[PDB]
Amino acid sequence: PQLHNGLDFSAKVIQGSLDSLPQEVRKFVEGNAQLCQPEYIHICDGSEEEYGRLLAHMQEEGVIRKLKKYDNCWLALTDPRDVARIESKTVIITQEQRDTVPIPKSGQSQLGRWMSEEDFEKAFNARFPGCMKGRTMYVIPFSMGPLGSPLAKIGIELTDSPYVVASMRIMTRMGTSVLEALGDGEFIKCLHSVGCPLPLKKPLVNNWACNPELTLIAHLPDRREIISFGSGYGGNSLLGKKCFALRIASRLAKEEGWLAEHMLILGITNPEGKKKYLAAAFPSACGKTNLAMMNPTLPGWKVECVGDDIAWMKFDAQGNLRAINPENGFFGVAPGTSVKTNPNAIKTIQKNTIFTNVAETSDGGVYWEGIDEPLAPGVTITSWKNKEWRPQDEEPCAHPNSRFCTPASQCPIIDPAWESPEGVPIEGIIFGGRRPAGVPLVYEALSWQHGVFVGAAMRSEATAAAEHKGKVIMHDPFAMRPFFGYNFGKYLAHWLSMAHRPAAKLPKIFHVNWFRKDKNGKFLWPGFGENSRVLEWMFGRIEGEDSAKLTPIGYVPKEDALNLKGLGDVNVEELFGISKEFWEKEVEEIDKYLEDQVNADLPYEIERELRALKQRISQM
Numbered sequence: 001p002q003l004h005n006g007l008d009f010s011a012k013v014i015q016g017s018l019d020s021l022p023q024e025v026r027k028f029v030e031g032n033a034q035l036c037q038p039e040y041i042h043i044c045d046g047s048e049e050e051y052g053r054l055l056a057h058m059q060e061e062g063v064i065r066k067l068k069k070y071d072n073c074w075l076a077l078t079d080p081r082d083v084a085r086i087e088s089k090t091v092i093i094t095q096e097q098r099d100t101v102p103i104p105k106s107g108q109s110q111l112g113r114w115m116s117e118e119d120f121e122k123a124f125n126a127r128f129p130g131c132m133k134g135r136t137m138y139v140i141p142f143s144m145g146p147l148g149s150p151l152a153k154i155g156i157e158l159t160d161s162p163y164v165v166a167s168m169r170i171m172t173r174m175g176t177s178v179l180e181a182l183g184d185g186e187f188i189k190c191l192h193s194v195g196c197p198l199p200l201k202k203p204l205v206n207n208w209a210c211n212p213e214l215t216l217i218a219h220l221p222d223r224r225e226i227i228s229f230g231s232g233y234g235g236n237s238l239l240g241k242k243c244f245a246l247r248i249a250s251r252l253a254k255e256e257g258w259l260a261e262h263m264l265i266l267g268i269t270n271p272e273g274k275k276k277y278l279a280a281a282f283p284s285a286c287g288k289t290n291l292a293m294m295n296p297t298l299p300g301w302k303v304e305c306v307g308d309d310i311a312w313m314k315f316d317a318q319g320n321l322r323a324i325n326p327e328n329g330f331f332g333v334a335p336g337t338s339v340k341t342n343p344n345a346i347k348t349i350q351k352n353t354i355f356t357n358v359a360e361t362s363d364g365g366v367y368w369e370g371i372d373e374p375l376a377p378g379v380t381i382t383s384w385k386n387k388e389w390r391p392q393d394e395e396p397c398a399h400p401n402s403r404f405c406t407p408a409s410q411c412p413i414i415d416p417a418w419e420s421p422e423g424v425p426i427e428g429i430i431f432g433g434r435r436p437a438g439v440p441l442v443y444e445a446l447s448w449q450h451g452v453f454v455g456a457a458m459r460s461e462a463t464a465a466a467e468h469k470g471k472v473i474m475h476d477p478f479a480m481r482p483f484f485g486y487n488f489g490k491y492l493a494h495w496l497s498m499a500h501r502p503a504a505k506l507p508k509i510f511h512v513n514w515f516r517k518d519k520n521g522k523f524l525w526p527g528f529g530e531n532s533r534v535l536e537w538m539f540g541r542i543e544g545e546d547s548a549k550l551t552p553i554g555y556v557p558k559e560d561a562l563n564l565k566g567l568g569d570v571n572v573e574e575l576f577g578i579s580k581e582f583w584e585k586e587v588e589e590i591d592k593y594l595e596d597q598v599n600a601d602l603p604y605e606i607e608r609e610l611r612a613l614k615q616r617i618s619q620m
């Protein structure tokens, strides 16, 4: 016991019991309760009633609105400063700096931000003492991946924001059963605070609590802890998504020998009755969600969805590379999602969905740019800035990074094996980014080493996901630039090593580019549902059909290899053109980038592929 009673927080528990919590679980709660000083402690159980009283509270507090037009849908407008995933204030703390990033040969590193325990201890004590003063601390027990699944991991998130608690219920498997499964096992320690203790010294915008000045998202892989402060928007507050399942998981996978990757997983079936699973890694806002729920334009072809952001993969006993979706919902970009682009999306977000920073229509509906849908006469739109918006203004009605949060189970084309703990065998890996010119529509890798190189050499123009602005093409190897959990050189090594495992069935590797333009500035490829035609060519190359043409960068489709029926007017000349003048400069940037950023931790095989390609391009 104790001498007085300053350490027994039982009297503050409004739901739950610290006596029912596992040993090292209760210590984690009480320790931080002492440090953050919350007014109440709410031990979540994930029940439908709990989710009810949670929404009502947020509504009576002025945080979220009800979209009367649809079944149980809610809007939320955030502070205009807390609108995206802050990549500049995301740090990983390890003892030695090399464990996190390779030491640059010259300038600063682009593959992560490292911070010492000394620097972090000072910044921590300047943020968390008393940050939950007057708020409720929610104890979220959640599971990444199916319960009882092998590659499944359990985490405890503490937060003072009911906006996180509700999202986590959509995005993860959160409740009481997750507590009884953990028992005395190991768990990830997640801590989150909006940084607005009461009384409010800073007036809030749109009733959105957040402290932008002090925002910090820190990772301590050595301690299995994630500590986020100030922000409360998606990737910053859903600690089980980017912080856990990608950064922390990547280090665990390296240690244990599996893979945690920023990739979608889709299964595709052909008219003959054969079905194959593919995985695609694209940067943020570049095509993953639209592709994972694609409505294909080719007859007799079916595409089911397993996940659209994170994949955990590992070689099974038979040498098959199996993958699972550790997430439980979809956290996609709203703008551009219309009945014509992503029709499967429209069928899912119509219920139990939490929209954030999208526009509201006066009849209780949602509206965003590119929705391609006429509104009824007399229907008025309120933008995400909570202002009466007309199409005559320049301000877009919905924020570019505005999101929807819908459960995966509601998807009409949900794969009947996405909850399967055994996973799905992966027979192909797809890379690509937003390349406005130069890169052909699709090509195939020449070997496992070349393929790993293709992903190391990914580049794309700056989209609207982090804080990058302008039409600048930057490097994003494996679409994982903002999510590397350890040294990128050893990351590359970890991938090349999969070729050494016994009886391994390595998948093919492809690179696509939907975003090529002409001299005028027009997309040479329709895309979206028409991308099914490039999936048909990949399905055949996996079966081993001779429809490829060797080129200085990889196998490209033969003449008359693509099912282009229904178009014909498409310019194949410029869509597959491979200019020497372009690739001679591309390798020059890829060379300078790898020599400077990866420096001494660059495996030799990747440099061998760089040389091999540099040569084949000069021989033209």
Ligand SMILES: Nc1nc2c(ncn2[C@@H]2O[C@H](COP(=O)(O)OP(=O)(O)O)[C@@H](O)[C@H]2O)c(=O)[nH]1
Residues within 6 Å of the ligand: 282, 283, 284, 285, 286, 287, 288, 289, 290, 291, 332, 333, 334, 335, 336, 337, 514, 515, 523, 526, 527, 528, 529, 531
């Ligand atoms: N031109 C073209 N644009 C696309 C295609 N797929 C998606 N987009 C655009 O890319 C944006 C983001 O797509 P999304 O799938 O949400 O990217 P994600 O961040 O990987 O999930 C959308 O607003 C679309 O307008 C495509 O095949 N072609």
Ligand SMILES: [Mn+2]
Residues within 6 Å of the ligand: 288, 289, 308, 309, 331, 332, 333
């Ligand atoms: Mn997505």
Ligand SMILES: [Mn+2]
Residues within 6 Å of the ligand: 262, 284, 309
């Ligand atoms: Mn993502």
Ligand SMILES: [Mn+2]
Residues within 6 Å of the ligand: 496, 499, 605
């Ligand atoms: Mn090797």
